[PDB]
Amino acid sequence: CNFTHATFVLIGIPGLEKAHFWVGFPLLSMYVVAMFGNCIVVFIVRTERSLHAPMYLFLCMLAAIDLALSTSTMPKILALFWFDSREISFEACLTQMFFIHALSAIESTILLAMAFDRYVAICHPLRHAAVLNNTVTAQIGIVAVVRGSLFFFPLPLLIKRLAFCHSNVLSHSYCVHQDVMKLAYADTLPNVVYGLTAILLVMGVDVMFISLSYFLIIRTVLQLPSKSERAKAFGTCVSHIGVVLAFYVPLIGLSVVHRFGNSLHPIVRVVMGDIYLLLPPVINPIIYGAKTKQIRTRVLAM
Amino acid sequence: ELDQLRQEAEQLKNQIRDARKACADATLSQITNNIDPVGRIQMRTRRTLRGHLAKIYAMHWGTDSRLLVSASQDGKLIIWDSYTTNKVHAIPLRSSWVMTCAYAPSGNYVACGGLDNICSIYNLKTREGNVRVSRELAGHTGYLSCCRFLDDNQIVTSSGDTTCALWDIETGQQTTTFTGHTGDVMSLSLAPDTRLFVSGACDASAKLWDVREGMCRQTFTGHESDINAICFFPNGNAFATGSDDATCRLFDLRADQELMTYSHDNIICGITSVSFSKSGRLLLAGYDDFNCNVWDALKADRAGVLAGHDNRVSCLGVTDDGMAVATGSWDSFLKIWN
Amino acid sequence: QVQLQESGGGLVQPGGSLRLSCAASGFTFSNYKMNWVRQAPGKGLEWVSDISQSGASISYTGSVKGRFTISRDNAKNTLYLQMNSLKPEDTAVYYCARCPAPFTRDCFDVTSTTYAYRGQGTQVTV
Amino acid sequence: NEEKAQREANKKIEKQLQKDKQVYRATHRLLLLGADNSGKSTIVKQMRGIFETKFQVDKVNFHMFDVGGQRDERRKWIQCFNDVTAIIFVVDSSDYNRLQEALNLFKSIWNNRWLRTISVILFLNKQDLLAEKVLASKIEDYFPEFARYTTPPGEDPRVTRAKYFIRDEFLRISTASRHYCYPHFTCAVDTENARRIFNDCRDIIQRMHLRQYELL
Amino acid sequence: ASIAQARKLVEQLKMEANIDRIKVSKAAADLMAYCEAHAKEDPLLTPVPASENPFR
């Protein structure tokens, strides 16, 4: 059209508006939990060379992606819910779109790497040292970063083709490729097709292989002879699958309710994107960092 | 008849005990009660030497107080540079289980040994540049537990066949065999003048031997369990032992009895590594409670805890200028303390 | 010095009773798991029984169960082995062994041919 | 001046140490133990100082140490073998005189503070001599609990009762106090022992990884 | 058998009984004097500053 909007308005929570500052009270604490739950943990697998295993390096890189995603998401939402700073510039909106989609991708394939490492270490335990070492851990890390960046740099390449003039208000507390493309008429079908295929290919292949890894790990640990160790392994597996699904089902759900399910209420989409971005950087510190004996003893020693 | 020899042996033991009882007019703690304590010594980990893959049993500092050789059960003798953290040499050993290592006073050679019953002498000053086996000293029956050089020419080794041995490296055979221990000899230590040396064994007894004579001059009893470590006082007239009964024990050669016991009710674990400071005022002992303790050698007060390890501390050495302490452990990490 | 003096051994008829008392000096009795071993003539060292630090854990070899008992007294620092209904295959020399390290429930090397923390034994013959 | 050449020498040394790290972690160390009359020599020469054997099962390298060069006192060098994956423990199941000695040795291995992490792969050799002793020396004389024991070999079930009694005694010592025991019944002529070692070490490293990734 | 080691132990105890033995107070005072003389040259008893510490 004739002109493009240079400033987008984020809506926050649709149903709840007056008590937004009240919602500003837990998330700030949640933010610092995320920061603590990454940064000290990253420190634990930075100075300590005793924890230079592939598993703990995957933990360190997952916490690094979690703190990067937290830095991308949390301050804008906190400034929104405190100071009513709903406005975001277009270049910063595209930067936020790319960074949270790319960091979701890199976190997704790092979680795939952890699931592969767990499957090889549990179900093929004598081939774990012969397959996975620190060099291939770094190589999977570079492949992870270039996979996310290469798969999701066409999102800022293709959003810039659109002209945003018929609407200005977004449907989230942040910029995603889900809802920015709906604010402009025409040339959105290539954006819809590319974004849906990128989500399904990268993160769907990741979630099917993580679920296959956890199913094979469950099938391995259900063959333990004792009742208590089998029950503990099944409980930890159900908790891990619950955290993985609480990262992955709101993702693909957000994609399919912004592609197809547009007739739903905005509150389920808002809380689905909220448990997609707000919750993994505080539950991945808990079940992956605090549950491990080495990281817990290192943070209790310091 | 064995009965009259047993009667003569217990009569001689009673005579030695009565001589030590009449000689014990006072104690070292009663004399040193009037002097001031050493306070609390907070040694920090100035450097951590990493690169070993398996647990460490031995280190030995160089006489230049910079390089140290360290022995680990992957079959690795790494000579480090503690000033600049770099590894000077990495020797792959023939046998994986190495239990001892030494660094020569000249610095040209190192030694190692363990379950392979053999002291392997390696040349660090080869003309080609690579480190090869200079000598392969065989003749011991039990496991080699401690070896220390006298010079480039001779080396004394303690082994698990209740014997020690002074070897000539040039001809590769034992010049002197020290016999008289009942249990497995776990550690030896040379005097500063290298004329006599003490050896602690698994019979709760430490024997002071002469290097040239080969006859056990003095025998020291008072421990309760297997002595795992031993070290002379820096003046050469006393020595401290560490054992499995959670007590360190300082004896004197001239007094020929116990001087002082280093123990606490909070410690139930054995001592694996014993050394003194430059002055000898601090006795540093590594323990099986994952840490080390800096006892006051004249006051028997635990003046410091070296708690940087999360496995068993097995070796602990002090530089010849007293500048640093390296507490190697079973974490495959040496830690330099100061 | 770790010293263990055994007494009470001697000639005894089969089916009788015999008390072995070992006096321990040079170490604290309450921290060491004390063993009784034996050596038959023309045979190696055979472990008979052991008692823990507090006396709660008492175990025997299978040939002496129901016939031999082992007790300790930390007050007067000694070990007892009482023998009832002596078979003629129980003739041996009996040594009082000792756990090599305190506060440990493992007893390495108590039946070694040259173990240090062991007495000279008493000849128990039928 | 000399710092740069020291840095390149250190870099080469850590490269060689990384290669040795992959070699060391690829191989699984085993400590073979047994009596003088026990069939551990046939065990270590079955798939063939310290008698060291490399053997490759399913492209996995197991390296096993038979320490026969030492004396009868073993409280100190056994602490060398804490980083091994397992202690192979050869027992003469047919020799009832030294069966209690093997039980005491297994108890001391199990309760040793530096061997609390290590699992023990128990090989009860001389099962054929145990069978020919049972069908033709009574184990009730050396073990009164066999008078009150019940079975929890094909030609006669008394052999099964005796072999499972010895296995139950060793497993009672094992379960009286992180590490498990893997008892096996095998003879001198048996080629399955490498496969049994492979499967038990697979279970050991699997349980270690289950503890590492916090499933256990 | 055991008579030879008994003879060696008896001979070792006989040659160890007749040694020159100074008092415990003399040796304790000698070690006190050595510690008091060498305490000025002990970098672990008295900590050194980082200017002359080679382990910064």
Side-chain angles (χ1 to χ4, degrees), chain A, chain B residues 1-131 133-338, chain C, chain D, chain E:
Chain A
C1 56
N2 65 294
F3 85 111
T4 64
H5 280 141
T7 291
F8 282 133
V9 168
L10 313 162
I11 193 65
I13 303 179
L16 188 152
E17 190 74 30
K18 293 295 284 181
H20 270 177
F21 195 56
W22 277 21
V23 176
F25 291 141
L27 281 71
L28 182 63
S29 181
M30 169 176 307
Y31 186 13
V32 310
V33 169
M35 279 295 147
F36 286 163
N38 299 314
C39 179
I40 294 156
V41 176
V42 162
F43 174 61
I44 289 168
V45 185
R46 189 51 57 199
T47 44
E48 315 279 318
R49 323 285 212 277
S50 54
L51 260 55
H52 271 186
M55 156 190 179
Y56 298 117
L57 276 169
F58 282 147
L59 291 183
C60 198
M61 294 178 71
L62 187 82
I65 301 152
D66 284 356
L67 62 93
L69 189 62
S70 185
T71 318
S72 305
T73 50
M74 301 304 327
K76 187 52 176 169
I77 305 162
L78 282 176
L80 200 153
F81 277 69
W82 290 348
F83 314 127
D84 289 343
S85 72
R86 298 147 56 87
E87 301 66 50
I88 175 166
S89 66
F90 185 74
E91 215 276 329
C93 179
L94 297 202
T95 302
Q96 179 168 50
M97 178 193 292
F98 172 91
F99 267 95
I100 77 178
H101 275 315
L103 283 161
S104 290
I106 297 158
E107 192 188 338
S108 177
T109 176
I110 285 301
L111 279 178
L112 166 65
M114 313 191 62
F116 176 73
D117 177 37
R118 219 188 325 271
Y119 162 71
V120 174
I122 290 164
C123 301
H124 307 287
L126 301 187
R127 320 296 211 280
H128 178 234
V131 164
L132 286 152
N133 56 5
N134 293 321
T135 306
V136 68
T137 297
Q139 285 175 4
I140 296 169
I142 313 157
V143 171
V145 171
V146 299
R147 179 170 190 247
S149 304
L150 162 54
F151 262 98
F152 293 93
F153 205 61
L155 315 178
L157 270 43
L158 294 174
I159 288 297
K160 272 290 299 154
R161 288 163 45 161
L162 282 72
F164 307 96
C165 51
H166 279 124
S167 191
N168 192 269
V169 57
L170 270 183
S171 198
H172 276 278
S173 306
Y174 52 71
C175 282
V176 286
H177 195 279
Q178 271 55 78
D179 52 8
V180 172
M181 54 157 195
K182 294 193 290 182
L183 298 185
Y185 287 161
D187 203 58
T188 64
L189 169 71
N191 281 82
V192 159
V193 167
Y194 177 71
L196 188 57
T197 42
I199 297 299
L200 294 174
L201 269 69
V202 181
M203 292 145 198
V205 160
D206 286 7
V207 70
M208 301 315 297
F209 278 128
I210 286 163
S211 292
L212 182 62
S213 170
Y214 271 119
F215 167 66
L216 288 169
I217 280 166
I218 276 175
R219 198 209 282 175
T220 295
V221 304
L222 280 175
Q223 298 170 1
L224 295 181
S226 56
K227 304 310 271 153
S228 158
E229 300 188 313
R230 184 198 287 135
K232 183 175 174 63
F234 197 72
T236 316
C237 276
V238 173
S239 77
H240 279 211
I241 293 170
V243 161
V244 163
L245 287 189
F247 168 65
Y248 272 108
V249 184
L251 195 153
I252 305 168
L254 202 65
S255 281
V256 301
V257 302
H258 279 98
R259 254 84 192 161
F260 317 119
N262 262 357
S263 290
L264 270 54
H265 209 275
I267 193 66
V268 57
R269 153 209 299 164
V270 159
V271 304
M272 212 205 288
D274 277 337
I275 62 170
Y276 160 62
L277 294 174
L278 295 175
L279 206 72
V282 300
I283 71 184
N284 290 355
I286 286 176
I287 74 152
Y288 294 125
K291 201 175 285 185
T292 48
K293 269 87 74 177
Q294 297 292 324
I295 296 178
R296 213 192 310 130
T297 44
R298 253 65 152 194
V299 65
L300 280 176
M302 177 224 77
Chain B
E1 184 62 80
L2 188 151
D3 204 23
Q4 52 193 2
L5 277 195
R6 173 208 303 161
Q7 285 170 231
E8 195 167 45
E10 63 90 20
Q11 195 77 48
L12 282 154
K13 273 150 70 62
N14 281 342
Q15 176 182 358
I16 285 165
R17 193 162 60 68
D18 286 1
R20 286 165 173 171
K21 188 71 66 150
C23 199
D25 48 339
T27 58
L28 173 57
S29 183
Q30 278 173 358
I31 294 173
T32 49
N33 202 65
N34 297 2
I35 72 167
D36 54 353
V38 303
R40 214 81 191 171
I41 295 91
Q42 282 101 17
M43 293 181 205
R44 274 290 329 280
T45 318
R46 298 302 150 85
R47 221 66 65 87
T48 304
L49 307 180
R50 321 193 193 82
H52 275 313
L53 320 168
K55 76 197 162 283
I56 300 168
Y57 289 176
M59 51 95 66
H60 203 211
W61 275 102
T63 52
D64 58 335
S65 159
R66 176 167 190 168
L67 321 169
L68 65 95
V69 58
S70 77
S72 65
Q73 312 295 306
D74 47 346
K76 219 58 153 180
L77 273 186
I78 297 169
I79 297 89
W80 308 76
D81 198 300
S82 281
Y83 281 4
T84 61
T85 301
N86 306 315
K87 299 180 241 290
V88 186
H89 287 123
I91 304 166
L93 306 181
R94 176 161 330 150
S95 184
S96 177
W97 319 100
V98 64
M99 294 178 71
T100 179
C101 84
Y103 204 110
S106 83
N108 307 317
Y109 313 110
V110 288
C112 65
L115 272 153
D116 62 357
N117 294 319
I118 283 157
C119 201
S120 301
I121 315 294
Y122 292 88
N123 202 336
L124 302 194
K125 294 291 171 50
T126 57
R127 201 182 292 178
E128 212 275 333
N130 210 32
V131 178
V133 176
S134 171
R135 205 41 64 103
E136 192 74 22
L137 311 163
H140 269 308
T141 313
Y143 66 96
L144 209 73
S145 58
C146 197
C147 60
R148 291 292 169 263
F149 280 95
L150 282 72
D151 45 350
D152 279 339
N153 181 18
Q154 298 188 327
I155 175 173
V156 56
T157 63
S158 78
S159 199
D161 60 336
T162 76
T163 68
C164 305
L166 176 77
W167 309 75
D168 192 10
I169 313 164
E170 183 70 28
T171 180
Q173 49 98 33
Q174 288 178 1
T175 60
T176 306
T177 298
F178 308 99
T179 50
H181 266 313
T182 316
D184 310 333
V185 194
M186 287 299 302
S187 296
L188 61 90
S189 193
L190 277 296
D193 50 334
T194 59
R195 304 310 320 310
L196 282 72
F197 79 104
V198 285
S199 83
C202 288
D203 68 326
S205 174
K207 285 192 162 31
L208 165 78
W209 293 97
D210 183 88
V211 178
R212 314 301 141 191
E213 180 51 58
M215 191 45 158
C216 169
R217 203 71 51 61
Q218 290 178 237
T219 307
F220 300 91
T221 44
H223 261 291
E224 282 176 29
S225 188
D226 316 305
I227 296 173
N228 311 296
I230 194 161
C231 199
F232 275 104
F233 204 82
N235 79 323
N237 290 114
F239 70 103
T241 53
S243 161
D244 266 355
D245 68 296
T247 68
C248 288
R249 276 168 210 276
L250 173 79
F251 312 94
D252 199 291
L253 314 177
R254 292 177 279 153
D256 200 72
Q257 47 190 116
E258 182 158 86
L259 292 177
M260 185 179 288
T261 315
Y262 304 109
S263 67
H264 205 268
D265 264 15
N266 271 328
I267 294 170
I268 65 163
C269 78
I271 302 106
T272 59
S273 66
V274 160
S275 67
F276 271 108
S277 191
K278 173 134 193 201
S279 66
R281 190 53 188 275
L282 297 183
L283 158 61
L284 284 76
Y287 283 74
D288 301 320
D289 269 331
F290 298 99
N291 294 347
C292 319
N293 286 309
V294 189
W295 300 88
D296 206 344
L298 305 184
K299 296 276 265 174
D301 305 333
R302 183 206 305 183
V305 168
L306 264 48
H309 285 299
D310 51 294
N311 219 338
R312 183 177 179 179
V313 174
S314 49
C315 56
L316 188 153
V318 168
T319 57
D320 282 88
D321 44 24
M323 217 55 85
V325 187
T327 65
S329 79
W330 284 6
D331 283 310
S332 83
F333 309 130
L334 297 152
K335 288 197 149 63
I336 308 295
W337 299 81
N338 202 358
Chain C
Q1 193 168 4
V2 176
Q3 217 172 3
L4 293 163
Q5 263 84 220
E6 298 111 338
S7 65
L11 270 299
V12 60
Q13 289 279 303
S17 166
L18 200 52
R19 188 91 171 275
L20 292 184
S21 72
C22 178
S25 61
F27 62 97
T28 63
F29 213 67
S30 308
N31 315 135
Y32 286 108
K33 173 169 162 193
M34 302 281 318
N35 299 14
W36 268 108
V37 307
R38 80 182 162 200
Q39 169 153 246
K43 219 175 179 214
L45 271 299
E46 197 266 334
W47 168 86
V48 173
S49 58
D50 52 354
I51 179 164
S52 175
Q53 288 86 9
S54 53
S57 159
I58 290 167
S59 74
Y60 308 95
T61 195
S63 47
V64 310
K65 286 177 71 67
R67 321 194 282 105
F68 285 14
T69 183
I70 176 174
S71 56
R72 72 196 294 138
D73 189 75
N74 290 318
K76 67 156 301 193
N77 189 359
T78 187
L79 200 72
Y80 313 120
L81 181 79
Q82 175 78 265
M83 316 196 193
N84 314 281
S85 309
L86 286 171
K87 304 202 141 193
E89 60 98 10
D90 291 331
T91 183
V93 56
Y94 277 80
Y95 307 94
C96 172
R98 199 210 80 180
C99 188
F103 317 110
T104 57
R105 44 171 321 180
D106 58 80
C107 290
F108 288 101
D109 310 334
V110 287
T111 68
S112 295
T113 59
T114 184
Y115 189 45
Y117 317 117
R118 209 171 61 206
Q120 293 174 357
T122 43
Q123 188 68 239
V124 175
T125 42
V126 301
Chain D
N1 296 1
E2 279 161 347
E3 190 85 10
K4 291 182 177 185
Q6 209 174 8
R7 277 218 209 85
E8 321 305 355
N10 186 25
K11 177 185 67 183
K12 182 188 301 305
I13 276 169
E14 313 184 338
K15 282 209 296 281
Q16 188 62 258
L17 260 56
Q18 206 75 23
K19 291 190 176 181
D20 288 359
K21 170 144 200 63
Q22 317 307 327
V23 166
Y24 180 79
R25 283 181 321 150
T27 62
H28 297 273
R29 289 137 294 276
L30 296 165
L31 162 73
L32 172 64
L33 269 158
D36 313 328
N37 50 358
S38 68
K40 60 163 186 181
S41 300
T42 318
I43 286 297
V44 66
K45 274 63 141 173
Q46 193 55 41
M47 63 284 277
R48 178 180 290 172
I50 301 103
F51 306 117
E52 319 170 358
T53 44
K54 299 260 307 184
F55 57 98
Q56 193 144 270
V57 188
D58 279 15
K59 269 82 64 181
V60 186
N61 284 106
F62 301 102
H63 187 273
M64 185 169 68
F65 305 92
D66 179 30
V67 183
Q70 299 300 320
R71 293 187 294 111
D72 62 358
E73 294 204 51
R74 67 185 68 188
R75 62 174 160 273
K76 290 305 176 177
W77 60 264
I78 207 75
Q79 308 163 16
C80 299
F81 293 94
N82 63 37
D83 44 353
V84 308
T85 62
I87 296 169
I88 310 298
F89 200 62
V90 172
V91 183
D92 277 337
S93 71
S94 62
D95 199 31
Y96 310 138
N97 290 318
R98 313 174 53 166
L99 199 62
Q100 189 57 74
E101 303 182 353
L103 288 170
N104 295 324
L105 183 52
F106 176 70
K107 200 187 303 173
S108 313
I109 281 154
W110 202 254
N111 299 134
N112 194 227
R113 185 221 181 290
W114 316 110
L115 319 177
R116 287 175 183 174
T117 308
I118 305 165
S119 309
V120 171
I121 301 171
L122 184 74
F123 278 125
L124 304 165
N125 295 114
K126 317 302 174 56
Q127 290 289 314
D128 62 357
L129 321 173
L130 169 65
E132 81 176 4
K133 196 167 281 166
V134 161
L135 311 193
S137 282
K138 303 301 169 253
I139 198 172
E140 272 145 29
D141 301 357
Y142 304 108
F143 285 99
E145 319 100 340
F146 197 78
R148 64 201 51 111
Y149 184 71
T150 45
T151 310
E155 312 158 1
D156 196 70
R158 302 194 314 272
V159 181
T160 310
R161 194 155 92 88
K163 67 198 277 185
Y164 274 88
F165 170 67
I166 298 155
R167 179 208 77 115
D168 271 359
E169 287 284 293
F170 274 103
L171 282 190
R172 192 194 58 204
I173 295 183
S174 164
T175 56
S177 70
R178 194 91 161 286
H179 65 318
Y180 273 51
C181 191
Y182 301 92
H184 293 304
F185 309 107
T186 177
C187 295
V189 191
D190 189 358
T191 51
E192 184 178 1
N193 287 308
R195 182 54 58 164
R196 292 176 182 177
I197 278 160
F198 165 77
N199 287 309
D200 294 346
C201 284
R202 190 196 148 86
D203 194 76
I204 285 155
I205 302 301
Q206 180 178 97
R207 226 168 282 262
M208 166 183 129
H209 289 163
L210 283 184
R211 291 168 204 134
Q212 188 183 136
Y213 302 80
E214 308 293 328
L215 281 73
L216 269 66
Chain E
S2 185
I3 193 67
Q5 49 183 359
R7 278 175 52 86
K8 294 285 104 175
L9 188 153
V10 159
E11 280 292 280
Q12 171 57 46
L13 260 60
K14 191 176 288 294
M15 72 155 258
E16 204 203 335
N18 43 8
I19 68 154
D20 290 328
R21 206 180 312 231
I22 62 170
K23 294 305 213 54
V24 180
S25 300
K26 180 68 176 68
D30 279 23
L31 292 188
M32 191 166 58
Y34 189 79
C35 294
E36 284 171 352
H38 278 62
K40 63 202 201 313
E41 308 159 48
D42 204 355
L44 300 152
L45 198 61
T46 69
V48 295
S51 296
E52 56 249 29
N53 195 14
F55 291 92
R56 295 153 271 270

